[PDB]
Motif scaffolding. Structure first.
Motif, short mmCIF file in Angstrom:
data_model
loop_
_atom_site.label_atom_id
_atom_site.label_comp_id
_atom_site.label_asym_id
_atom_site.label_seq_id
_atom_site.Cartn_x
_atom_site.Cartn_y
_atom_site.Cartn_z
N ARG A 316 22.34 17.51 43.03
CA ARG A 316 23.66 18.13 42.96
C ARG A 316 24.14 18.19 41.52
NH1 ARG A 316 28.97 17.48 45.63
NH2 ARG A 316 29.09 19.40 44.37
N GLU A 320 24.81 21.64 39.63
CA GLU A 320 26.16 21.94 39.19
C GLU A 320 26.19 22.29 37.71
OE1 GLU A 320 27.28 21.59 42.22
OE2 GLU A 320 28.86 22.99 41.58
N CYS B 264 20.30 22.69 56.66
CA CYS B 264 20.44 21.91 55.42
C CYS B 264 19.90 20.50 55.57
CB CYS B 264 21.91 21.84 55.01
SG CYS B 264 22.56 23.40 54.45
N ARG B 318 22.41 24.70 45.68
CA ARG B 318 23.58 23.84 45.54
C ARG B 318 24.44 23.87 46.79
NH1 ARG B 318 27.08 27.80 43.60
NH2 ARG B 318 28.73 26.36 42.94
N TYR B 319 24.43 24.97 47.54
CA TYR B 319 25.12 24.97 48.82
C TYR B 319 24.46 24.01 49.79
CZ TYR B 319 26.67 26.33 53.45
OH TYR B 319 27.18 26.31 54.72
N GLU B 322 25.29 20.52 48.71
CA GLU B 322 26.69 20.22 48.99
C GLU B 322 26.88 19.85 50.45
OE1 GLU B 322 29.12 22.71 46.41
OE2 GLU B 322 30.80 22.58 47.84
N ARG B 323 26.31 20.64 51.37
CA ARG B 323 26.43 20.33 52.79
C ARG B 323 25.78 18.99 53.12
NH1 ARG B 323 30.62 22.70 54.68
NH2 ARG B 323 29.87 21.64 56.57
N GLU B 325 25.51 16.34 51.16
CA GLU B 325 26.40 15.27 50.70
C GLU B 325 27.61 15.12 51.61
OE1 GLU B 325 25.94 14.39 46.69
OE2 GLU B 325 28.09 14.32 46.24
N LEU B 326 28.17 16.23 52.09
CA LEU B 326 29.26 16.13 53.06
C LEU B 326 28.77 15.48 54.35
#
Lengths: 328, 328, 327, 325
Positions: A316, A320, B264, B318-319, B322-323, B325-326
């Motif tokens: 990430r 980023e 993901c 990165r999407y 990001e998912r 990590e959420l």
């Protein structure tokens, strides 16, 4: 403390090919066209442990006495050196204990155990893991396997440069990532014994430039703080023997920030389809900065992709920064 | 060779000359996932093909089967991704001219990948539909043979070689999970396995916002989808093929759908277990398998999925990250 | 006349791995236990042309000038050197003409043609084939590719020794077949620059020992007759530059007879399942005789299987001598 | 006595690729030009034990129960089958005893020991060694690994034919050597289930034609004398199951003499640089005879180089015959 002549013979004697293999030297086609140079990547991510460290660890551990092998080996590592020592221990039939900080990810600990190593979680940082590994070394008779500061470890990494000269003898400049300087010392001493016309340049992260600090001062010095972005090169003090070789044989040194490193990770993914860890892309980032600063054109330039053991969620940060670089 | 029976497909799968361009890909155990999910979970590594997706199998079988007249006149298709790379590579290996039409807005790295494999690229259209319309028009004007991405019996037989390899790499397999775009890969895997080991279950996996096969199964015939999700580009297909739907309705055992977050999570599983970076359509089938294991309380079995492709945009990752990590 | 250091850099610069490959260094199990030594064989038969000669041929030809490749290359050869130049010309996109004696077996000229080289059949023996090749060379301007007497040919063969040192640096002695002397010169100059403690022994057939004759005389001399059994080493006069290096770096030399060579063929077939040609088993034969004459035990000893391009019907002679040894 | 469909599923389930590998199908360039056919050779000499027999042996041994594996396996063989059983036992972690005639050459005993097998030298011929093998099997409980007459052995060899169909689906005819007929049964049953249009032809040495004899009589018979030149096919009586499959699925049978075998050894050495043993060149010899007898031109024809474990000194006879021809 051997001379260059003795190092050359040690590079030849180092039995790295009982565990490590010869890795490809690949042309980066997109980046070569863009930067008007022939840019080649030494794919050390293709080793069984996915970093170069297997070479020096196996060399040193194969060269131990029968008595030392019977008492086993110990080390402290955050990841790549641990896998090198675990893999070498399985091949040699030797007991290996690896001390890692308690915050070490389960994927890293599992990888070391998968390669046949015993793992001890201890310490709030790497310094406390290394203290436990040295203490346990003296208490229980384990032999300490240093991650860089040792002539047999330096000779082992020097096998990498010997492959390079046979894979491409018309190389102009080789760019080497630096943590404690084991790899840079091995490459630089080997190349200066055989093909001294080739320039060897050390590359360091700006927040982890312990060799640059040692060169400025004229001797090894401690860094107040070491950045952790590039795990493999997060070393506070350059080695004693590695510095002796690096100060003597390196032609130049360059430093780069986190932005350049992340740009290099993207470059390697698009040209050779590999996800390098930040320390694996470090030498490429240095080469790109060198090319612009010195206006290099028409040369054959090589860098070492030294490792590809990346934390997935840690990507990430890298992605980023790359997105932020696109916005500019 | 228009609507063949199972026995005729089986012989077609043996006759497909896919190994003149494609290779037998590994069938690997996912160690972490297998211990976590209490099943033996295997992955077919189609990302290891020279174009990094299975689509080379169907394209080469169909193109090598054309007449000497058709080959001399060249082939054409419309695609910005995997199918275009498979047609380009096949045309280079067969020595046949190939024109690939892509929307003008297609990214340079996609265009250069197809060109690097040997395909002429014509940029045209504001979207895929206009690119396809141009290709079909140029087919009528200049006599290019259109190469369909899934709806063709020879393309289906070419993909079926994947399943023939699976039966020889592990005949103790319980269930196989397959991603579905237009249905070419699922039709080939299903008809092959139902001819040789009918006790093996074949389950199709679709993205929730791209499930044109579930829609065609609900209706009993091919229907058009109003909107198709673009996250998983490989399976963004509005209407299932006629011949693939015939075979899928006849030979599939079950079907399942999964959302973006499941995909993901699967990408993260494949990076940590087999060190591959799958594209979303390449992790679709593993997402499908993980939902199926939980819905049906499956334990102690041998389950295979196909990593169908690994042509990923670096910045698109990165999407996915990001998912993930959420998700913790 | 380069120095040792220059030959070392030439070996590293030799672009041999664009045509040749790194060959295995195998232990011979049966022979090792029997002779109480670790005996290793360098499998140069595994090259694309099935002899070592690809290394020196490609290095020399890659290193010409663009003008020289345009005019083409010529050489004279009875077998293995021809396939090296043919193969190197195809990879480099260069025209290659090979003069071979009229009596050359069809399988040998077809192998040269198959590798992409023009063959001219001429001469009652190798001398008349070389004379026509040098004659065409002066007249039409083809660049002559020497089979051994040339620093770049020697540097190319030297890459074999550099591989040996990285494949096993605890070697005690290396035994090298000698024809014209290029391989022995490459191996000897390379090893004495990097690991001079390692002994390099030349091996020659008794009726073709032109290096022995040159060492006895102190200069290259002509042999009256040369045996034709071992074709690859049937050279009447040692090369000038190979002799200089051999005289300067070799540790020893030994000769063997046809019985020893034939016995070494049988050994290589049973230990590593290869049919060596007589020249390819030569070094092994020297090694066995060296072990007995010097009472060598517990060492690591390497020989080079230099080629495996054998005439099938020509194997009758080897098999016949082995049956006589069995009796 | 399984049916054709059951053998097909057996061939797919045979775990041969845990010990054996997919071998090259190579075109013979010189022989293809001379005979006006595309002649391909299946290189089973490239298996770790240098014969196809590792396929059948590993498939049978891997299919044994845990108790059988714990008690070990036994067989009787002086050549290729011994090496296959030995190698399989080392990969499966199973004890294997191999009984060999006392006159067996040292290099043959050492090759089996090198692969991980225990060798017991016993008997004045193969029949006396086999009798000791079965005796030791009945007393100590070793599982007998048959060289050919077994359905799992047959399905193990049949993987060879499944590879052939994927390597070249435009094959016209396949030629298979026959000793006990395990290879021919496995190849013929596999091909006739998937691509029956392909002709399978058994080849036998005249001095060892126990299959032609069984076909003439309509059931397995005993050959009075067997020729020993082609050691691997020197089998007195065709198996029961291999004959059932061969009789139903073969298209044709052809025999050849010693000189044809020798000429084939020379052809393989000159085209693919391998030294076949006589049993491994047998199929090629039969194919050359077939091509002439039926005037075959412009087809794709495959034979199996079944083994290259040769006696070096034995090459003298082969070479002498080739010079006389």
């Amino acid at each position: 403390a051997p001379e260059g002549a003795e190092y050359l013979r040690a590079v030849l004697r180092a039995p790295v090919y009982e565990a490590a293999q010869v890795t490809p030297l690949q042309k980066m086609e997109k980046l070569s066209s863009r930067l008007d140079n022939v840019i080649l990547v030494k794919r050390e991510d293709r080793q069984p442990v996915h970093s170069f460290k297997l070479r020096g660890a196996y060399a040193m551990m194969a060269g131990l006495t029968e008595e030392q092998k019977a008492h086993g080996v110990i080390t402290a590592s955050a990841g790549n050196h641990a896998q090198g020592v675990a893999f070498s221990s399985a091949r040699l039939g030797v007991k290996a204990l690896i001390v890692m900080p308690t915050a070490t990810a389960d994927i890293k600990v599992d990888a070391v155990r998968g390669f046949g190593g015993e793992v001890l979680l201890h310490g709030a940082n790497f310094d406390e893991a290394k203290a436990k590994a040295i203490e346990l070394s003296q208490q229980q008779g384990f032999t300490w396997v240093p991650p860089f500061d040792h002539p047999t470890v330096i000779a082992g990494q020097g096998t990498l440069a010997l492959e390079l000269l046979q894979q491409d003898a018309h190389l102009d400049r080789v760019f080497v990532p630096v943590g404690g300087g084991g790899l840079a010392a091995g490459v630089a001493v080997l190349i200066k014994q055989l093909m001294p016309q080739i320039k060897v340049i050390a590359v360091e992260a700006e927040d982890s430039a312990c060799l640059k600090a040692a060169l400025d001062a004229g001797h090894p010095v401690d860094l107040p703080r070491v950045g952790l972005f590039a795990e493999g090169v997060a070393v506070k003090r350059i080695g004693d023997e590695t510095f002796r070789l690096c100060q003597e044989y390196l032609d130049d040194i360059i430093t780069v920030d986190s932005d350049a490193i992340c740009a290099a990770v993207k470059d390697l993914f698009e040209d050779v389809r590999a996800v390098a860890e930040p320390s694996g892309a470090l030498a490429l980032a240095g080469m790109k900065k060198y090319i612009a600063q010195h206006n290099i054109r028409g040369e054959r330039l090589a860098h070492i992709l030294s490792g590809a053991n990346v934390n997935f969620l840690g990507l990430r940060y890298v992605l980023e920064r790359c997105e932020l670089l696109e916005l500019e």
